[PDB]
PDB file of C-alpha atoms and ligand atoms in Angstrom:
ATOM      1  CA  UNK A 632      76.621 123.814  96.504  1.00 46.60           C
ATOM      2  CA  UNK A 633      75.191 121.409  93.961  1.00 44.06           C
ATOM      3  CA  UNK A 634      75.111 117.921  94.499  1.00 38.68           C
ATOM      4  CA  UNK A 635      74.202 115.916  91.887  1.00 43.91           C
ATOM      5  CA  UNK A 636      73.875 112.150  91.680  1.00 45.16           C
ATOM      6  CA  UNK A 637      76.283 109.743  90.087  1.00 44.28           C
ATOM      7  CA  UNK A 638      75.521 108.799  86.742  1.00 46.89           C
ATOM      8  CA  UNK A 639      75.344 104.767  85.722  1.00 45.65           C
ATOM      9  CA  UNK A 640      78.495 105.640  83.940  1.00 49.37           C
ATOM     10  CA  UNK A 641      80.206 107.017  87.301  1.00 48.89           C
ATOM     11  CA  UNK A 642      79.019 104.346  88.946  1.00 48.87           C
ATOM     12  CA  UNK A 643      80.484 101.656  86.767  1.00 49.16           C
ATOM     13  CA  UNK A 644      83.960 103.566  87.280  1.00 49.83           C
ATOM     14  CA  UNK A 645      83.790 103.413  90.457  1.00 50.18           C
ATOM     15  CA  UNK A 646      82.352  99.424  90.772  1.00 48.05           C
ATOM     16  CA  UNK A 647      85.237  98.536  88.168  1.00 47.27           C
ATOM     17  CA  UNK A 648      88.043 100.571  89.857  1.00 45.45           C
ATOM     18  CA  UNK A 649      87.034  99.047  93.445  1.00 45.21           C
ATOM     19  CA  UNK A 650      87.096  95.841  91.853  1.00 40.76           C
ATOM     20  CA  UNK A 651      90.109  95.978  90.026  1.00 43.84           C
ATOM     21  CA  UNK A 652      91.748  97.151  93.794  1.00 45.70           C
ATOM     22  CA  UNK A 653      90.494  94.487  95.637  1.00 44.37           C
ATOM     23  CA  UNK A 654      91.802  92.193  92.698  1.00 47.21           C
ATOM     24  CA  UNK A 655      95.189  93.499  93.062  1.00 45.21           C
ATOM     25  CA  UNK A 656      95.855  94.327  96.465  1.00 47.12           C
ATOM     26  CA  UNK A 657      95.815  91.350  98.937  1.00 44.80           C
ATOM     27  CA  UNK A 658      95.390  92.861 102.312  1.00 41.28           C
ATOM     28  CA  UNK A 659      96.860  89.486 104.048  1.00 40.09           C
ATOM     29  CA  UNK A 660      99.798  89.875 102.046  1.00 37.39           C
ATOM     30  CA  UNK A 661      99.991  86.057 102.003  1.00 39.52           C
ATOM     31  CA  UNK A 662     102.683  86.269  98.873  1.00 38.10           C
ATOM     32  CA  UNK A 663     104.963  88.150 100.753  1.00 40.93           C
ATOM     33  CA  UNK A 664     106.644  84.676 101.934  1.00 38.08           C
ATOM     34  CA  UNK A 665     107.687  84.175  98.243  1.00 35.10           C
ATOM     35  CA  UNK A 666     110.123  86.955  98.391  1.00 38.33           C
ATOM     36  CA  UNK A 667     113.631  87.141  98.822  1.00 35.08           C
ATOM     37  CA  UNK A 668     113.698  87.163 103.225  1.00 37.17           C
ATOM     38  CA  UNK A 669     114.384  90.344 104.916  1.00 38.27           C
ATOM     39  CA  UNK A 670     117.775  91.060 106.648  1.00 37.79           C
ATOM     40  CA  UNK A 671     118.208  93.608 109.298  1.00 36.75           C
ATOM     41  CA  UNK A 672     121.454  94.219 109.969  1.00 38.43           C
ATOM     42  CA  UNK A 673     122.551  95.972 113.245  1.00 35.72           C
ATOM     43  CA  UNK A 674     122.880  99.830 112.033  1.00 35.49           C
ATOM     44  CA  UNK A 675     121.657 101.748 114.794  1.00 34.22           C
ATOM     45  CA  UNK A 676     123.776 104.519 113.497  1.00 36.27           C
ATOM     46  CA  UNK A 677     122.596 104.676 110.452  1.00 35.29           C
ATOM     47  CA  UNK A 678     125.797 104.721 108.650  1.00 33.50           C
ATOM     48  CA  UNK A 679     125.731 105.215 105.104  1.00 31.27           C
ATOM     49  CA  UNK A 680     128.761 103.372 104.354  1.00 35.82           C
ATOM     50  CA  UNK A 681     127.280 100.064 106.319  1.00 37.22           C
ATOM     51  CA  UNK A 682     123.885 100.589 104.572  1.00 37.36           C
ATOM     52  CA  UNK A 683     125.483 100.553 101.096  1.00 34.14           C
ATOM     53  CA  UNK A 684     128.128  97.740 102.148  1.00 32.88           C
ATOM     54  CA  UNK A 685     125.361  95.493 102.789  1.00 33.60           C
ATOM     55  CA  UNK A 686     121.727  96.693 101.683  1.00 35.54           C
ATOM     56  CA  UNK A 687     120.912  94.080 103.806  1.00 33.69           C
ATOM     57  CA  UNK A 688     117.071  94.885 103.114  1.00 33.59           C
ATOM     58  CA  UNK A 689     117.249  95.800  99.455  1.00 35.25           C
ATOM     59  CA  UNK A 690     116.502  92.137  97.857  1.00 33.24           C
ATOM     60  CA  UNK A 691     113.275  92.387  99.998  1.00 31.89           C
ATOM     61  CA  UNK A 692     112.427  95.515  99.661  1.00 30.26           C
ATOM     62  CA  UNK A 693     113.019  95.124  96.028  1.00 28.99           C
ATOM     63  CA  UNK A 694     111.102  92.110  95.459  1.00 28.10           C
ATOM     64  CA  UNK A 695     108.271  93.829  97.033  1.00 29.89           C
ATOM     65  CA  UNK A 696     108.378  96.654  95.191  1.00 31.72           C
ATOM     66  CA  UNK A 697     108.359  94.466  92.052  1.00 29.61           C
ATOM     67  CA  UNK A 698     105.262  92.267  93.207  1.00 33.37           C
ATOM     68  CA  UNK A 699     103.629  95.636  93.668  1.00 29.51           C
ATOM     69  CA  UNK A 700     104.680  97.091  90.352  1.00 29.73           C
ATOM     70  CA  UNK A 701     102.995  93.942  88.752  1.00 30.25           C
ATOM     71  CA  UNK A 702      99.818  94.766  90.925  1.00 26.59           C
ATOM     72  CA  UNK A 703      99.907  98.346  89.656  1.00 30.08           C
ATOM     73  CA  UNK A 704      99.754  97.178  85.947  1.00 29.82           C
ATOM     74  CA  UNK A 705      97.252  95.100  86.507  1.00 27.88           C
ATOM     75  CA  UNK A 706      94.972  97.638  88.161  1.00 27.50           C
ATOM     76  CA  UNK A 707      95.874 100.221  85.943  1.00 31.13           C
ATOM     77  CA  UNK A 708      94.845  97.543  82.970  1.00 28.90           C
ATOM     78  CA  UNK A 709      91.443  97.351  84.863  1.00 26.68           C
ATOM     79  CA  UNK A 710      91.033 101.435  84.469  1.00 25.29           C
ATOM     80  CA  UNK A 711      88.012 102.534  82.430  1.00 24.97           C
ATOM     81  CA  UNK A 712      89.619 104.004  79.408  1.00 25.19           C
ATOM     82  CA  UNK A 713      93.610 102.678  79.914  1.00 26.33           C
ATOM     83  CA  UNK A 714      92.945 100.158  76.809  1.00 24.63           C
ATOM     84  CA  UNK A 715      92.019 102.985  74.568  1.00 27.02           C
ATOM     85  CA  UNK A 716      95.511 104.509  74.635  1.00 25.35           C
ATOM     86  CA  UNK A 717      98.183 103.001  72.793  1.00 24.91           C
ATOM     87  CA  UNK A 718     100.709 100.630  74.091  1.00 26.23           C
ATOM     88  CA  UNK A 719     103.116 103.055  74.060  1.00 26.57           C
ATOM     89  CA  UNK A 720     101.426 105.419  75.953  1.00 23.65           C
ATOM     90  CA  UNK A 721     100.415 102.688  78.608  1.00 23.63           C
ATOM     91  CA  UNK A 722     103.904 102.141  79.293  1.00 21.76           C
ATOM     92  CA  UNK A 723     104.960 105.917  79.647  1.00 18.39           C
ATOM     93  CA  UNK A 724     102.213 106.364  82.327  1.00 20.41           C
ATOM     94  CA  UNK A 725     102.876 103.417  84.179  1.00 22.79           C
ATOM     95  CA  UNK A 726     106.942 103.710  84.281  1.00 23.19           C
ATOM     96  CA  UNK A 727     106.308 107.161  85.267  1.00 24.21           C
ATOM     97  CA  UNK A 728     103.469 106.417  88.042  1.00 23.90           C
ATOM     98  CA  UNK A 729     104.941 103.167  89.294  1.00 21.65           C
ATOM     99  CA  UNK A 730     106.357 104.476  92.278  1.00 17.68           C
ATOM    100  CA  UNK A 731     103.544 107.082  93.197  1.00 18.83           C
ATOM    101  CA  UNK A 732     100.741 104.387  93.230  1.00 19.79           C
ATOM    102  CA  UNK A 733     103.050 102.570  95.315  1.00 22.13           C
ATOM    103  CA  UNK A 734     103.552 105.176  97.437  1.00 19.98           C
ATOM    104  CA  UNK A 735      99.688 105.745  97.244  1.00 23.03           C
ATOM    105  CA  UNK A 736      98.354 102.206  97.801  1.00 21.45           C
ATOM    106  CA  UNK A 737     100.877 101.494 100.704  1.00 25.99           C
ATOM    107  CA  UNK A 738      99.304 103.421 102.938  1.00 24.59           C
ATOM    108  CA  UNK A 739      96.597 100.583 103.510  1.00 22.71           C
ATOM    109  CA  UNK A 740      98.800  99.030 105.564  1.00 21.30           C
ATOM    110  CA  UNK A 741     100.837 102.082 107.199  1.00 22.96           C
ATOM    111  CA  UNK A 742      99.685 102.592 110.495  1.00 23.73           C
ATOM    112  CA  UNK A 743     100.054 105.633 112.425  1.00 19.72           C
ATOM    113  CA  UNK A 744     100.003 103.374 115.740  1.00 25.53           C
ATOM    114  CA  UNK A 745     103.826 103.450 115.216  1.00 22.33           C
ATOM    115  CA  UNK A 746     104.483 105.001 111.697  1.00 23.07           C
ATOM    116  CA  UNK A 747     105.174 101.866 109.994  1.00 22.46           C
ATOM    117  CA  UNK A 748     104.181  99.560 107.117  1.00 24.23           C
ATOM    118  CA  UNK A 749     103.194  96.403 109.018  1.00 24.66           C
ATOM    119  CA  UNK A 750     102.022  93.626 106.649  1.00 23.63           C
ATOM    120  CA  UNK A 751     100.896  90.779 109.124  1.00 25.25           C
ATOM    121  CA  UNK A 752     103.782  89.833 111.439  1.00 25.44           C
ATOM    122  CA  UNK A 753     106.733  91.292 112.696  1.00 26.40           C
ATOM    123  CA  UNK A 754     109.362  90.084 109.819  1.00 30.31           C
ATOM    124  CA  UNK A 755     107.246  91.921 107.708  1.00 28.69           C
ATOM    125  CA  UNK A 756     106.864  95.745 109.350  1.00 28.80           C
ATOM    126  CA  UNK A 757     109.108  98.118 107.276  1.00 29.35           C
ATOM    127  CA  UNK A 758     109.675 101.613 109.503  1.00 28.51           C
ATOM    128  CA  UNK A 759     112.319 104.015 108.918  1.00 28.79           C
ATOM    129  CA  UNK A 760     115.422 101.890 109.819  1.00 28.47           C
ATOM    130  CA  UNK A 761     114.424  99.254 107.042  1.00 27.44           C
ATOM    131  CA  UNK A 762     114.054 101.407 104.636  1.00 27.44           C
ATOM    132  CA  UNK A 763     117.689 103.364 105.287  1.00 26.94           C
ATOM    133  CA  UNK A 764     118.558  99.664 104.988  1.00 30.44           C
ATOM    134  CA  UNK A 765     117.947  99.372 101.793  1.00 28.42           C
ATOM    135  CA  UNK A 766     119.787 102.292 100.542  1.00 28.73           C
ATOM    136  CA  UNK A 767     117.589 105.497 101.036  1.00 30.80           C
ATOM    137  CA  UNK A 768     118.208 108.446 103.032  1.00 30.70           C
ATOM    138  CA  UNK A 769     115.828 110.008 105.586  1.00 30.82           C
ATOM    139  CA  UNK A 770     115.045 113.055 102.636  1.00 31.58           C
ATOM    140  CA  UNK A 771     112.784 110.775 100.959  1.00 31.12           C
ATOM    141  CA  UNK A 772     111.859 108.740 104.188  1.00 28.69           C
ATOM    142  CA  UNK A 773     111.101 111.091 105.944  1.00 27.10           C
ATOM    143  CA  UNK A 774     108.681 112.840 103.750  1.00 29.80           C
ATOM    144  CA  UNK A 775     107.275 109.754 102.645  1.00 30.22           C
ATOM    145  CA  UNK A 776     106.445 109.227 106.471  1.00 27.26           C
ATOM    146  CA  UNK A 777     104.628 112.544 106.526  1.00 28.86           C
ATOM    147  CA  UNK A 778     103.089 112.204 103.460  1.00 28.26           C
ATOM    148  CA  UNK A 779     101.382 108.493 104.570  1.00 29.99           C
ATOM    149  CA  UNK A 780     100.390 110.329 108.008  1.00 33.80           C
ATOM    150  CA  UNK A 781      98.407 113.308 105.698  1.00 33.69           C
ATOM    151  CA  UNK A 782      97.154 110.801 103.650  1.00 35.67           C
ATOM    152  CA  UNK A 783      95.827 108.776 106.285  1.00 35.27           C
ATOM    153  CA  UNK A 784      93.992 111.982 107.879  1.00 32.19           C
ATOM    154  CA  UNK A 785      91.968 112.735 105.405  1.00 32.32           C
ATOM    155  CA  UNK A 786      90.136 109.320 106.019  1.00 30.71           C
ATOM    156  CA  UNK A 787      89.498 108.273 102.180  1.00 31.42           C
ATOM    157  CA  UNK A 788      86.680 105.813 101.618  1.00 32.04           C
ATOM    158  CA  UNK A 789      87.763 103.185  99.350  1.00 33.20           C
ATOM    159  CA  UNK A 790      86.123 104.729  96.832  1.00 34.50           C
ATOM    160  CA  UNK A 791      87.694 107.667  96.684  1.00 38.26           C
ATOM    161  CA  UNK A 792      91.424 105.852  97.397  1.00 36.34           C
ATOM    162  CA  UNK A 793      90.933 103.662  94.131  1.00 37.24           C
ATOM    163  CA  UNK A 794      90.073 107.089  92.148  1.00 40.42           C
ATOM    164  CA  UNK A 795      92.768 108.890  93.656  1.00 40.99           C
ATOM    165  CA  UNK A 796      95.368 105.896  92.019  1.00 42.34           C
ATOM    166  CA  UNK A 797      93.505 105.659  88.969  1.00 44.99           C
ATOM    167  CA  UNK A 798      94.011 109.573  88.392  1.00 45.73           C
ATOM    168  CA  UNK A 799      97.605 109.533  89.752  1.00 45.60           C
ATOM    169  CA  UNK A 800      98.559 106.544  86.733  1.00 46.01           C
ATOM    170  CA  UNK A 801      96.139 108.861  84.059  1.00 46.46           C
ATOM    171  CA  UNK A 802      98.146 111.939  84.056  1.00 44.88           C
ATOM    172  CA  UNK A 803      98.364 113.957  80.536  1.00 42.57           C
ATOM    173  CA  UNK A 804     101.166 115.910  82.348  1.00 41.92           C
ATOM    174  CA  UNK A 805     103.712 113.271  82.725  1.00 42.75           C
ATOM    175  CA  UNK A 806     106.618 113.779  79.913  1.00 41.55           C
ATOM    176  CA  UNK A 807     106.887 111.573  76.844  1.00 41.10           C
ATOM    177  CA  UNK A 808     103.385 111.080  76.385  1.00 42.22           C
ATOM    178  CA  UNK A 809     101.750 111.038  73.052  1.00 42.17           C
ATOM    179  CA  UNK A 810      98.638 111.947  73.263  1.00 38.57           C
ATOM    180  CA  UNK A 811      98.007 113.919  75.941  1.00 40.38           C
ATOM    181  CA  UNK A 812      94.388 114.906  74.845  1.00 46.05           C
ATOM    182  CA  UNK A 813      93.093 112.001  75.472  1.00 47.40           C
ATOM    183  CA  UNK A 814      94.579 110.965  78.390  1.00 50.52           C
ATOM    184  CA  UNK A 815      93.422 114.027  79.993  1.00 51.70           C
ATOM    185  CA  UNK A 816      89.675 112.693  78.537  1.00 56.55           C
ATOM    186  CA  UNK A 817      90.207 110.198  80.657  1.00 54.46           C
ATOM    187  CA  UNK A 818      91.496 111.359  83.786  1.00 52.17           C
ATOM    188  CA  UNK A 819      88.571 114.305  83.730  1.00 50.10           C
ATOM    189  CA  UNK A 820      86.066 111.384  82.970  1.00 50.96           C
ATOM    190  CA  UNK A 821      87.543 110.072  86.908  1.00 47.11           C
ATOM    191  CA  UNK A 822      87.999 113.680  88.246  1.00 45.18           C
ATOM    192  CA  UNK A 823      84.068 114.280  87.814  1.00 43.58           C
ATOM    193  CA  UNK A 824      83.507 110.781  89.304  1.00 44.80           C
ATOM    194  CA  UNK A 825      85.393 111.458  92.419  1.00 44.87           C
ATOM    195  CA  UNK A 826      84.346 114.950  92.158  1.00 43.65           C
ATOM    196  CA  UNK A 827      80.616 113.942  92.372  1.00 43.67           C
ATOM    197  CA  UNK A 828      81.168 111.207  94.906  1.00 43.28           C
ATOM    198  CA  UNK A 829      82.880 113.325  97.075  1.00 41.88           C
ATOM    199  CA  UNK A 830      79.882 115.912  96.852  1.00 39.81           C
ATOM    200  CA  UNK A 831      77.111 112.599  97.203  1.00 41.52           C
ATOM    201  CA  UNK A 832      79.030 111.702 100.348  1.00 42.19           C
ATOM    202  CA  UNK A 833      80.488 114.698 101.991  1.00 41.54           C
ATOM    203  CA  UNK A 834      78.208 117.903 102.548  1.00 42.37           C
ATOM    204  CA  UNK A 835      83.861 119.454 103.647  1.00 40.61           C
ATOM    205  CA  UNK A 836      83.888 118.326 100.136  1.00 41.05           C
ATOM    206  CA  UNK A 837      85.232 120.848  98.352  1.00 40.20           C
ATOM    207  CA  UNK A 838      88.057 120.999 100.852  1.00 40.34           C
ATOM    208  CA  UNK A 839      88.458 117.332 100.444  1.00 38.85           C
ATOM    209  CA  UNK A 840      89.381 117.220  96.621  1.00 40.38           C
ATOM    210  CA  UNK A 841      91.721 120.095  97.209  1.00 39.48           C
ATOM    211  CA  UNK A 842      93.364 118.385  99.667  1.00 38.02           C
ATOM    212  CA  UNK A 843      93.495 115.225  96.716  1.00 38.91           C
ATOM    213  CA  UNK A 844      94.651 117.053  94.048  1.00 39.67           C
ATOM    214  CA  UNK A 845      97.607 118.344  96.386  1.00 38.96           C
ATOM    215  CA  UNK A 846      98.589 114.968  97.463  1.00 39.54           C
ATOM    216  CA  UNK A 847      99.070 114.340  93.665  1.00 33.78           C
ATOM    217  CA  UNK A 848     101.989 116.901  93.744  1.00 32.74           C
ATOM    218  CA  UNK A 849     103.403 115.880  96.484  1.00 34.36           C
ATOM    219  CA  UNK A 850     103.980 112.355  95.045  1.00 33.18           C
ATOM    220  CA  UNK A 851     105.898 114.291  92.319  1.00 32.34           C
ATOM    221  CA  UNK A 852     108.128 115.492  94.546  1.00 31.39           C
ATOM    222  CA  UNK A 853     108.820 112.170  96.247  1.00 29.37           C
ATOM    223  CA  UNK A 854     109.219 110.973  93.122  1.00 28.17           C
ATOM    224  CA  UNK A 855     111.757 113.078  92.024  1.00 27.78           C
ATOM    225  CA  UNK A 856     113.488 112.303  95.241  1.00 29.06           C
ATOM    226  CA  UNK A 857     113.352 108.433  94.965  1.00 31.83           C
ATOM    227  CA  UNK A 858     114.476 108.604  91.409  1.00 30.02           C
ATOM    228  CA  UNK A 859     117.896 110.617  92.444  1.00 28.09           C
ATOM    229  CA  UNK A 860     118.211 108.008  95.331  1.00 29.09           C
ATOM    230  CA  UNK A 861     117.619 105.145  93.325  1.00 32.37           C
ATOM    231  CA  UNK A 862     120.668 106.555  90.914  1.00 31.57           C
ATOM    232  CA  UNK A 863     122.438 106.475  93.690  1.00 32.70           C
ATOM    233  CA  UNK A 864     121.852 102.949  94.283  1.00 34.36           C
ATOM    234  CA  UNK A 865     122.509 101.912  90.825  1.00 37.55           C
ATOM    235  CA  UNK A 866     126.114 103.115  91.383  1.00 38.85           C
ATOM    236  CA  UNK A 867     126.787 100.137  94.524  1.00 42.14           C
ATOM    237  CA  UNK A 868     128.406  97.394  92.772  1.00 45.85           C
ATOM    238  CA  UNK A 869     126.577  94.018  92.325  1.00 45.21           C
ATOM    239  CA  UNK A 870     123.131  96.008  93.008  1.00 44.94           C
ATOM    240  CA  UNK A 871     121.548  94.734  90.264  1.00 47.66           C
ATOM    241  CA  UNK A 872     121.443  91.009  91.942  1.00 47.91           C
ATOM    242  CA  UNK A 873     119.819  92.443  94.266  1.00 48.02           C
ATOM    243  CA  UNK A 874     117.000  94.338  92.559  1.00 50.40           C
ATOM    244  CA  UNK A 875     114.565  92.315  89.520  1.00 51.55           C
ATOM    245  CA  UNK A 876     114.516  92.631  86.072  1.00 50.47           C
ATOM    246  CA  UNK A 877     111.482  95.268  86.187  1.00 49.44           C
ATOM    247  CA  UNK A 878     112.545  97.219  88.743  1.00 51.32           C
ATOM    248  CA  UNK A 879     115.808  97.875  86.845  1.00 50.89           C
ATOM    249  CA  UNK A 880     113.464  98.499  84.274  1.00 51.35           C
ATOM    250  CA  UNK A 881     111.021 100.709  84.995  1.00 49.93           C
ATOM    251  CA  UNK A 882     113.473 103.152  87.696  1.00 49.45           C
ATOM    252  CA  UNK A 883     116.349 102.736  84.623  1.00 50.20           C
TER     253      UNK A 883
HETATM  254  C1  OCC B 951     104.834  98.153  98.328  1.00 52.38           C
HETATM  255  C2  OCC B 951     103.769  98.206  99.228  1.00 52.38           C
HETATM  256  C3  OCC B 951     103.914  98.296 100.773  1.00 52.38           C
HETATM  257  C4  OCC B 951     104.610  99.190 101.507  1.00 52.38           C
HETATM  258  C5  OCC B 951     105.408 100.304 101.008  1.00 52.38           C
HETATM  259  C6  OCC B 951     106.524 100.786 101.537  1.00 52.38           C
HETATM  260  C7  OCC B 951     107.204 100.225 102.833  1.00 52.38           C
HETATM  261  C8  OCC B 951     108.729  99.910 102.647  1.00 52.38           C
HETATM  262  C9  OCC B 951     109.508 100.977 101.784  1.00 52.38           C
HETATM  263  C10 OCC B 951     108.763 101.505 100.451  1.00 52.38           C
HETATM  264  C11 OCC B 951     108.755 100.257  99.403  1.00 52.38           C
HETATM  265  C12 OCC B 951     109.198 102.856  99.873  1.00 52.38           C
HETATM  266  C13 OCC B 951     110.641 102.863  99.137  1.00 52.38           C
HETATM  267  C14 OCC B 951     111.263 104.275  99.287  1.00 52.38           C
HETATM  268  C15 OCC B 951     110.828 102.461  97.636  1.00 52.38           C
HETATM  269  C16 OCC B 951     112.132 101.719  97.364  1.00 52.38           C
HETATM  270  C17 OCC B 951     112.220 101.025  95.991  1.00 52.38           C
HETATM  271  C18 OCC B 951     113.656 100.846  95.429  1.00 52.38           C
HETATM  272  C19 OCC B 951     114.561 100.006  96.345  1.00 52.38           C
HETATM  273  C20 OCC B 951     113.623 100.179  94.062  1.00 52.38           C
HETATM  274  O1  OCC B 951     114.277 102.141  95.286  1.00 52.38           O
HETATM  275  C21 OCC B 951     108.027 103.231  98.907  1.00 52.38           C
HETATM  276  C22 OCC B 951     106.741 102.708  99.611  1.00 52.38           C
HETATM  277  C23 OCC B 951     107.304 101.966 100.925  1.00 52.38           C
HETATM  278  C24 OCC B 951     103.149  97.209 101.567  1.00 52.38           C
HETATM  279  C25 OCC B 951     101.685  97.019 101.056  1.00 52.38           C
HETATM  280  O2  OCC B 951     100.908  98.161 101.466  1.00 52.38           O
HETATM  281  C26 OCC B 951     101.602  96.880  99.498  1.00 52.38           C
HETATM  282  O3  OCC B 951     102.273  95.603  99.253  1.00 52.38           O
HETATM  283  C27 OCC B 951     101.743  94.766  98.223  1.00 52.38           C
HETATM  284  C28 OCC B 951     100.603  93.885  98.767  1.00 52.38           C
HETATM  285  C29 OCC B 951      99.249  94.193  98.094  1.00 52.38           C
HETATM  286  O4  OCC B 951      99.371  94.269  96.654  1.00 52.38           O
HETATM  287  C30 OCC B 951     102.270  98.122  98.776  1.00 52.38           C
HETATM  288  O5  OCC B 951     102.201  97.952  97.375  1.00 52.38           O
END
């Protein structure tokens, strides 16, 4: 019912967070020459044993991934409220939320045209078949896929996408954190915001924050998932090569 107005404060979050995104997120992805090239190797069938023989896409895939990781910190860095917590802490929420903002701020440049990833040309749209390349199965694919398509339907502004991170990376509830207390502070200080900005903007709204909060858990669940898959991975000799030092890292 009540709409009230953003505060100054709310609307510093939101100028900071926005900034901090466009910062870290290069929607030419011009840097994506730098990594390791992409190799598809003819697997129409998607065998498993061929996939893991070659994970023709991994070094790719995983340089990506580690370019984004590096984005992620520095965004998260940029969050009203991150430097307050202790190092420790910092490095507990962004281990554990690596791979959910990823998931999160990917879908800028997933396009339900033809359910891919395309960033710029041809060499660099990642569907399905590139990802089984790299090692996953379709039961975290698959999902994924469906959870970029929901995400995409609810037609965030950026505003509300940059919150949405922000609150997935400030999570008291993710284990081995300290102090929980205040890193809830923080995450309610950016639930009001997008709370209020949702209200400000959409008469609707309370649906639309529901439908937020419930993408959070899903990314749980495809996190679980990636993190047995990734184990998985570990297991193919020589895999390391073809991952980085921080991937190894923060999915160890
Ligand atoms: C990374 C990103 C992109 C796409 C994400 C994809 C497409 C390929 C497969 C991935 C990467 C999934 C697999 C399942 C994760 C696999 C990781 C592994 C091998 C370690 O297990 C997770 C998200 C999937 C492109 C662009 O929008 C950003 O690109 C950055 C440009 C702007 O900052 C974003 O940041």
């Amino acid at each position: 019912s009540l709409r009230p107005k953003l505060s100054e404060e709310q609307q510093r979050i939101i100028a900071i967070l926005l900034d901090a995104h466009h910062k870290t997120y290069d929607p030419t992805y011009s840097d994506f020459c730098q990594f390791r090239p992409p190799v598809r190797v003819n697997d129409g069938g998607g065998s498993v044993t061929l996939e893991l023989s070659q994970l023709s896409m991994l070094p790719h895939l995983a340089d990506l991934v580690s370019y984004s990781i590096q984005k992620v910190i520095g965004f998260a860095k940029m969050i009203p409220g991150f430097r307050d917590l202790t190092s420790e802490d910092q490095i507990v929420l962004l281990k554990s939320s690596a791979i959910e903002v990823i998931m999160l701020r990917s879908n800028e440049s997933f396009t339900m045209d033809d359910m891919s990833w395309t960033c710029g040309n041809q060499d660099y749209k990642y569907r399905v078949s590139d990802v089984t390349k790299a090692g996953h199965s379709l039961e975290l694919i698959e999902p994924l896929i469906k959870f970029q398509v929901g995400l995409k339907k609810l037609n965030l502004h950026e505003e509300e996408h940059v919150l949405l991170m922000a609150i997935c990376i400030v999570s008291p509830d993710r284990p081995g954190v300290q102090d929980a207390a205040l890193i809830e502070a923080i995450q309610d200080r950016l639930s009001n915001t997008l709370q209020t900005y949702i209200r400000c903007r959409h008469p609707g709204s309370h649906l639309l924050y529901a439908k937020m909060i419930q993408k959070l858990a899903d990314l749980r669940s495809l996190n679980e998932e990636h993190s047995k898959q990734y184990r998985c991975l570990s297991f193919q000799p020589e895999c390391s090569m073809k991952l980085t030092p921080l991937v190894l890292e923060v999915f160890g």
